[PDB]
Amino acid sequence: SVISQVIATADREVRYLSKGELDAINRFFNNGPQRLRIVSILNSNAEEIVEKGARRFWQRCPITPSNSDNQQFQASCLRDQAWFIRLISYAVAVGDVDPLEASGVRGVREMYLSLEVPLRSVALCMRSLKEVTLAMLSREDAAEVGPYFDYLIAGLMP
Amino acid sequence: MQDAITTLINTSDAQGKYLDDSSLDTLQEYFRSGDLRAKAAMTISANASTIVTKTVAKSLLYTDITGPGGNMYTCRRYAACIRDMDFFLRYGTYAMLAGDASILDERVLNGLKETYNSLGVPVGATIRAVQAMKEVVNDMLGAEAGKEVGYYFDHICSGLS
Amino acid sequence: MQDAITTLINTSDAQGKYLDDSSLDTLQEYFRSGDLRAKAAMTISANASTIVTKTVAKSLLYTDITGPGGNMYTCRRYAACIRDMDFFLRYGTYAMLAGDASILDERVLNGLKETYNSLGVPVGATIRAVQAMKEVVNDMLGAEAGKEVGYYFDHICSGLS
Amino acid sequence: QDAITTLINTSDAQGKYLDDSSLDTLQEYFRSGDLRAKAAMTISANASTIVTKTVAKSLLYTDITGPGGNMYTCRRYAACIRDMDFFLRYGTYAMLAGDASILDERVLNGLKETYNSLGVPVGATIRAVQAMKEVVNDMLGAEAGKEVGYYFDHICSGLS
Amino acid sequence: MRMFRVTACVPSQTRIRTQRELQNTYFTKLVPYDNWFKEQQRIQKMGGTIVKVELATGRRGANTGLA
Amino acid sequence: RDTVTSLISNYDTTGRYLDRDAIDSLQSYFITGANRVKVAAMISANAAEISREAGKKLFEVVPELIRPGGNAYTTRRYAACLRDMDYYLRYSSYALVAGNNDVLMERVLQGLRETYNSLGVPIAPTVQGIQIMKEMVKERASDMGVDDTSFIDQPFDFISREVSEIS
Amino acid sequence: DRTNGGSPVVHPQQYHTVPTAVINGAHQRDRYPNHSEMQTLSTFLRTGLQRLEIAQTLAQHANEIVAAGFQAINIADYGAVRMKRSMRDLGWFLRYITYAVVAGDTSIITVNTRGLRGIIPEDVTVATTVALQEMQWKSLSFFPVDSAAAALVRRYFDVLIADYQVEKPSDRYRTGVSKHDQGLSFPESYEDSGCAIPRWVMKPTLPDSEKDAVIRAAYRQVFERDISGLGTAELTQPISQLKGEDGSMELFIRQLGKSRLYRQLFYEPYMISRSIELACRHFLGRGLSCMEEFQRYFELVADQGFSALVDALVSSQEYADYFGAETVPYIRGLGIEAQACRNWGPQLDLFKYSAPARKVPQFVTAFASYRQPLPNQHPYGMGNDPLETQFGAIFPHETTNPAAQPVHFSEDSRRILVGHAHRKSHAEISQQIFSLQHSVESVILAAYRQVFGCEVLGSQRHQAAETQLKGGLITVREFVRQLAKSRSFRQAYWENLYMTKAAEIIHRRLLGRPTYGRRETSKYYDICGRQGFYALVDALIDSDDYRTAFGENTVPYERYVTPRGLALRSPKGPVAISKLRDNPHTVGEYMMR
Amino acid sequence: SIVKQIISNADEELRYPTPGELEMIRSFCKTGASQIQLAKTLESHAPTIVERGTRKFWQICPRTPSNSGSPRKTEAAQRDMSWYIRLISYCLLAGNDQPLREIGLLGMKELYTNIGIPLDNILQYLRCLKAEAIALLSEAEAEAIIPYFDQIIQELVRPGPSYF
Ligand SMILES: *[C@@H](C)[C@H]1/C(=C/c2[nH]c(/C=C3N=C(/C=C4\NC(=O)C(CC)=C4C)C(C)=C\3CCC(=O)O)c(CCC(=O)O)c2C)NC(=O)[C@@H]1C
Ligand SMILES: *[C@H](C)[C@H]1/C(=C/c2[nH]c(/C=C3N=C(/C=C4\NC(=O)C(CC)=C4C)C(C)=C\3CCC(=O)O)c(CCC(=O)O)c2C)NC(=O)[C@@H]1C
Ligand SMILES: *[C@H](C)[C@H]1/C(=C/c2[nH]c(/C=C3N=C(/C=C4\NC(=O)C(CC)=C4C)C(C)=C\3CCC(=O)O)c(CCC(=O)O)c2C)NC(=O)[C@@H]1C
Ligand SMILES: *[C@H](C)[C@H]1/C(=C/c2[nH]c(/C=C3N=C(/C=C4\NC(=O)C(CC)=C4C)C(C)=C\3CCC(=O)O)c(CCC(=O)O)c2C)NC(=O)[C@@H]1C
Ligand SMILES: *[C@H](C)[C@H]1/C(=C/c2[nH]c(/C=C3N=C(/C=C4\NC(=O)C(CC)=C4C)C(C)=C\3CCC(=O)O)c(CCC(=O)O)c2C)NC(=O)[C@@H]1C
Ligand SMILES: *[C@H](C)[C@H]1/C(=C/c2[nH]c(/C=C3N=C(/C=C4\NC(=O)C(CC)=C4C)C(C)=C\3CCC(=O)O)c(CCC(=O)O)c2C)NC(=O)[C@@H]1C
Ligand SMILES: *[C@H](C)[C@H]1/C(=C/c2[nH]c(/C=C3N=C(/C=C4\NC(=O)C(CC)=C4C)C(C)=C\3CCC(=O)O)c(CCC(=O)O)c2C)NC(=O)[C@@H]1C
Ligand SMILES: *[C@H](C)[C@H]1/C(=C/c2[nH]c(/C=C3N=C(/C=C4\NC(=O)C(CC)=C4C)C(C)=C\3CCC(=O)O)c(CCC(=O)O)c2C)NC(=O)[C@@H]1C
Ligand SMILES: CCC1=C(C)/C(=C/C2=NC(=C\c3[nH]c(/C=C4\NC(=O)C(C)=C4CC)c(C)c3CCC(=O)O)/C(CCC(=O)O)=C2C)NC1=O
Ligand SMILES: [Cl-]
């Protein structure tokens, strides 16, 4: 969130929250309800987002552990899609990527290397998830949500 | 560093003068470019690795700078060049989003030329590849925001020449 | 760090005499085990990433330790567990190549129980993961070298105990 | 400590009498107390039923109850059911006292270390505890449940 | 190991040094290769004008043997 | 962690999505945010007055601290105590902006009792002065026009509760 | 409620005398005081005659001095409290002048006076300086001003007036180095009171002895002690590159860090985390501020070794901000900068010269376990928890390898213990009971193996109690009490033991379970401290828990343990914590479909 | 500025600016026209505030180096105060307090104690300017610029705000 880091910045160069930072968090508090309503829409659409995104991911990437004949790998992948959607809704609710960075970006590359799951394939799945979510959301709702998808993708795009 | 707002404030403050109408309209232009500058910065943040991959593919691969005796031979040097490119792209993102290229002047171009001449890193291939990166971001961002980040890619190219 | 030769010399130096005959017999045992020690360390060095991967796959995946509220949730913590297993494997390989578990006591075991209780890291699940690692390392080197390094894995489990 | 005791201890460190805002918090406790005693009555009456529906809605028919699972081996299912009784009774203590000090003083100290030494799944326990919170909320109304679930979330936060 | 001979002057812009915290800023310093990238970034972060970077030790184009 | 990130982290650790209780709590915090920013502004404008006058009131009510036996006798210790007052006021204002005591948890209560026992600093005048700060910010918030003084009540009470002993 | 980082003994310096400053300088240079420092001490002790008699005459005439002490204010308009504070301040200023005269240093005046311009309401500062000038005039009026020490009294009063005329001096700031690092502020009075620390700056044109002093201070910072006298400091190429025109103090700090001397001292005997904390001491002059700093360091060491950690510490922004290029790192403690409360205990145990005496990493344990609930620990720390073996009171020594995590439990807090009753079964725990295992002799032997976990020698047999129980004169409970009141039991569990440790181990042997909380432990410790050992034994045998569990005819047995005890009693791990995944399929080996 | 602080914080961690930083930038750019108009009101009305504040401060405090007979000290006092309001307008346009701190709070007390101006009289003069700026501009436009007046004020009341 912007408010935690502006607190940390005021803490570092020791002072109080100056008036410009106060207007910044005022605009954050004013934009709160819209983030809440789009979070509610994402919670309503999360399951169908996972289904359509997995279908498009297998269309755009058939050689994957999820698309193999092993359904444990497919179930783990679908669980991963749902988990990243939940974390992205967390990021939308917070207004920055702090739940996303804390839970599913920091160390996600090391995990999927330890799982041998190709991180380009996860990035493509999150691309398809982004397309499904932007299709399922309004233009301004897409404008809010798509950056968090971009930041989840870029966290594994390597 | 300086951004657009800080260079305007600095130019007025080094004169004992409030910001004037030309400065207020220049700051207005900055404010109305802010939305697409933020969107372009997010697009680059998403696609940085792809940018660097395509840039090195179309400007620096399958030439003798890659094979034996080349400067990009011996994989640690290729990785050093790729690190240089991630830094170039992120600092161009900083310059384009901040509105001023002063971040480039005080964190790239100070020291970069003498380091490259100290190491034998060819500046001309660096500049050609950096403008290929500019062309890539032109290709997949659009004409307007692509040119906006391309201005600071031009500054990186000029400051290395 | 006291390896087998070093701790042997230390016993004889505290006793003040030269290495007695039985101590030379144990040093002969170490000196004829050293070739298979080097080969086992060679294979662990080659396949360390695979060993940790299959070990976590057989002891830490698909349990509630990886679900929400489990300690391996929140990807950075999964990576922390991977790097702890890497520390366990590399330091057990050091102890096997050295012929004594002093590197395990000094670099690993001397306060890891305090740190794991402080962080809330599962001690019992780490012990199960280390025994699973002993099984995995046992599987692709064979019985002799496998138990020779599983002694040090069991030492890790005893020091976590 | 209970809510009155925390208020008295905050005042007594200053060495003064309870002030007006602390008197207002005393009013809040002294007009929540009736529904606290009623919720404690109903929870004491239906503790076994709450624990049963808790285990059913969260812990059953997953491999935690199967062979190899932590809740296999009937004595371990008994120990899990007994921990659930302890969690519900201590949540009732926290709700009646108004403070989670009884939770931190008798439940949460060394429980993470104990469970993690024994290998008890922490995340499954937090899941079952929130399920028990759902059971209490559903069969006591949101009116009562918004209090007891606060201490259940205290147990969940301390466990995680 | 290959060394960089670096002359730079790094100014302070966030703190007033009282009388003892003042040290110097114009340093000429032998820099190891594996740290020179981070030292260049650090003295660019603090705002230093780097006036002189040369290769003190080692040659250019070394495929091996440079450390 | 503010209220938003704390509640989000709790639901992340249990694996649930956002239910309507969370949406209501988040909207409640977002509505109270205007008052929180107003109090942060008044605090940033009158912080030196609030902290120093609370120190003065504490030394009037607890006379011994400025007396030679007390641990705020000389002006070195007096300035150290007033700087501690500014510390408490600044981090309580941070918590007022955030609405959560995580900032206090990690940056005020992270060893305060150990420091105050090492230096001989009395705990109970420290929390008495914290309460004087809280009553001061309460009364100039009421004069400023903020009817809900509940928000500004909580960080000082949290610091007092975590710092004070058990009688 | 939260775990304790330790409250170490701290002595904050309020000022400096003349001997304290000289000894501080000599100590901070690691040497005997030299001839000019000797002349400092001897000349000040020579003037001590004049200084003590000046203080004598000023204290003797203090009443008239402050009676004598712009627009003179009115008593009624000013207020009674403010008049009282005016008189108190005036007598206080005179007292501190005499304090300075005896101490021979104006550090007390300068520290306690310089930032007083606005503390005193600053509309009475003209009145304040006029009163101080009049006190100077009067003090010199009855102390003859021709060529005597009235010049000294004039100088000290002038210094007091000069300090008081100094307006608002800026507080020093320890700015936060990262988002996780809190920024701290620091009064200049606290800065000037703090002990002077030498700032060893090495310039290329320094003389050789000054350079060698800077080298020795670099050894004292990094290697914690002077190693130059030893032949281990043979680092002739790093020293030689450092002395002349190149290889500055930062590169030399890095070369000291990556040397095998540093590895032998602070990396070879330590795990990675303790090594990281010691490196933080030796290269930045401070401990770990926060957990996230430690995460950065630990991840970096995990993928790149400890030498890269040294490279990152000496290549950091904080290093160049404090120690720059050619300043030796110095320890940043109490009065050097503003201290955080976050790492107070670990960092004051780290700045102490006995920081290598601790092996368990103090910073990470405190930082992590503050964000965790209360641990399973005896209420008076973990040293009071004995080792759960058959026999032997084995407690962790507070001095030998201190692995101490202090924790405050409430009086009503209770320990969670793993009972053997719910575990296992019946006819599995009734094999370890030994009631009335029907032979008397076996019950005597089992009562021994409870009271002393192993069978004892003949000299430790309480044969009179054997005859009493074989005759039926006393029951099993009285026999256990007599065994616990035997001399050899006192030697085994009471004499060579800390008293609460002794009480806890006697409770474990006579009750078969650890204590629960401060209720029980407080009562036993109070009993054994006001009444003694036999009183505690009688109170434990006549404890209601003994009667409910072991009754009168049953030998005590272990019933509950700490969870650490079972973790010791399962070195292969617990039995079945989650179903294993024998013959699993992982990606990569599956993908080669 | 806001973009300056975000770029510095992002380059510290060697990372691209997050979506929340870009939301902060876009919100500030949305309010940019409003803040420009705030600065416009400040530009128009600054000399009146300076002259009324200097008259009021001279009346409330005659023992003042500007109030001493020299014209250059007087001109320097007006110059300093107009410079401070200039930095406040800079703070309005940048979006944070960087151009007050960096261009005149950092090292200000020691600057004036080297100059010889008493800082309590500076505090009173700034209090006077704050009063006439409150009474002069408007109500809503005061809420944007008077907090920065409080920020420059709060740096010099701290030897100790006086009580009994
Ligand atoms: C009035 C408040 C009481 C009082 C205070 C007092 N404190 C100290 C010294 C210190 N105070 C702190 C505090 C903090 N550091 C932090 O990081 C935090 C959170 C931001 C806090 C609250 C510290 C660390 C110190 C040590 C010195 C330092 O400045 O770093 C003193 C001086 C101690 C001495 O004798 O030297 C005093 C006087 N004293 C009273 O009597 C009041 C009850
Ligand atoms: C799906 C998009 C891709 C894919 C996935 C895949 N994942 C696994 C296994 C795991 N994935 C996780 C995930 C997370 N841990 C976290 O903490 C978070 C963030 C909050 C996430 C998303 C975990 C924990 C596992 C381990 C198994 C478990 O749940 O315990 C697998 C299985 C690998 C194996 O060998 O079992 C797979 C296949 N597969 C694809 O094809 C996609 C690219
Ligand atoms: C073959 C085993 C795998 C594989 C090969 C592959 N490589 C490339 C492209 C390049 N490979 C290199 C390699 C090196 N440069 C060095 O300095 C060193 C050490 C001496 C090495 C090994 C380079 C520089 C390139 C870039 C192209 C160039 O040489 O100019 C490709 C082409 C990829 C593309 O799409 O362009 C391929 C296919 N591919 C596999 O699947 C194998 C596992
Ligand atoms: C890539 C486009 C070209 C290339 C690169 C290359 N660079 C190096 C070594 C260094 N490059 C730098 C870079 C920077 N310094 C700065 O301050 C900035 C920040 C904006 C940058 C980008 C530095 C510091 C080094 C030396 C330290 C280090 O390598 O970490 C090499 C290696 C040279 C060698 O001898 O090993 C290479 C190969 N080479 C090409 O051919 C491209 C045109
Ligand atoms: C993996 C098998 C299990 C697990 C691991 C886990 N560990 C941490 C965190 C840390 N682990 C250590 C360990 C060590 N310190 C040393 O010096 C050595 C070297 C020999 C070791 C092994 C430390 C110090 C930490 C803290 C620093 C860090 O986080 O990297 C975590 C994260 C805890 C947290 O709260 O972030 C985890 C998850 N967890 C399991 O569930 C596995 C059974
Ligand atoms: C059949 C003779 C009687 C009966 C059975 C019944 N059982 C269940 C559910 C469970 N029973 C068990 C059993 C065990 N767990 C253990 O650890 C041991 C030791 C090996 C045993 C015997 C378990 C685990 C379950 C839950 C299912 C699971 O594995 O998760 C039910 C269903 C109850 C419900 O509400 O679903 C039933 C019906 N019912 C009768 O009427 C018979 C007398
Ligand atoms: C049930 C929700 C989960 C579960 C439980 C489980 N617990 C144990 C064993 C113990 N649990 C405790 C805990 C407490 N004792 C107390 O007095 C209190 C009240 C404040 C608590 C919370 C203790 C001390 C034990 C050991 C003694 C005993 O036998 O119960 C087990 C047994 C584990 C084993 O036998 O190895 C189990 C199964 N397990 C799950 O999987 C559920 C998620
Ligand atoms: C003999 C081969 C070596 C040796 C032994 C020695 N031991 C002690 C003292 C104790 N030994 C123990 C051991 C145990 N307690 C248990 O519960 C078990 C099983 C888990 C064992 C093995 C204990 C607790 C003690 C202390 C109390 C007691 O003496 O009963 C000593 C005495 C040392 C002293 O100072 O008391 C000695 C000498 N010494 C050697 O040199 C041999 C290598
Ligand atoms: C050098 C010894 C020393 C002194 C004299 C000192 C000053 C001091 N006096 C102080 C204060 C005052 N001195 C004075 C008075 C004077 N101080 C003087 O020396 C004279 C001549 C005057 C003007 C009449 C007043 C009115 C106060 C107000 C205190 C308040 O604000 O409540 C204080 C604050 C603590 C307290 O109230 O006790 C301090 C710290 N502190 C020190 O360390
Ligand atoms: Cl003298």
Residue numbers in the entry:
A (entry chain I): 2 to 159
B (entry chain D), C (entry chain H): 1 to 161
D (entry chain R): 2 to 161
E (entry chain S): 1 to 67
F (entry chain J): 2 to 168
G (entry chain K): 3 to 71, 149 to 515, 539 to 695
H (entry chain C): 2 to 165
Sentences from the paper on this structure:
Far-red light photoacclimation, or FaRLiP, is a facultative response exhibited by some cyanobacteria that allows them to absorb and utilize lower energy light (700–800 nm) than the wavelengths typically used for oxygenic photosynthesis (400–700 nm). To address these issues, we have isolated a FRL-absorbing PBP complex from cells of the marine cyanobacterium Synechococcus 7335 grown in FRL and solved its structure to a global resolution of 2.78 Å by single-particle, cryo-EM. The fraction containing the FaRLiP-AP core complexes also contained ribulose 1,5-bisphosphate carboxylase oxygenase (Rubisco), and the structure of this enzyme was solved to a global resolution of 2.35 Å.
The FaRLiP-AP core structure was solved to a global resolution of 2.78 Å based on the map-to-map Fourier Shell Correlation, although some map regions were challenging to model due to preferential orientation (see Experimental procedures). It is generally shaped like a cylinder, ∼85 Å in length and ∼95 Å in diameter. Nineteen subunits were identified: eight ApcB2 (β-type subunit), six ApcD5 (α-type subunit), one ApcE2 (α-type subunit with two REP domains (Pfam00427)), one ApcD3 (α-type subunit), one ApcD2 (α-type subunit), one ApcF (β-type subunit), and one ApcC (core linker). Other than the ApcC subunit, which is a core linker protein that assembles into the opening of a trimeric AP toroid, the subunits are arranged as (αβ) heterodimers that further assemble into three (αβ)3 toroids. Trimer 1 and trimer 2 are closely associated, forming a face-to-face hexamer, and trimer 3 is more separated in a tail-to-tail assembly with the trimer 1-trimer 2 toroid. One anion was identified and tentatively modeled as chloride, and each subunit except ApcC binds a single phycocyanobilin chromophore. All phycocyanobilin chromophores are covalently bound to their respective subunits except those bound to ApcD3 and ApcE2. As previously suggested, these chromophores should contribute the most red-shifted absorbance due to the absence of a thioether bond from a Cys sidechain to the vinylidene moiety on pyrrole ring A, which therefore extends the conjugation system in the chromophore. The chromophores of ApcD3 and ApcE2 therefore likely serve as the terminal emitters in the core complex, linking the other phycocyanobilins in the FaRLiP-AP core complex to the Chl molecules in FRL-PSII. Based on all these considerations, we conclude that the FaRLiP-AP core structure determined here is missing one (αβ)3 toroid with an accompanying ApcC subunit.
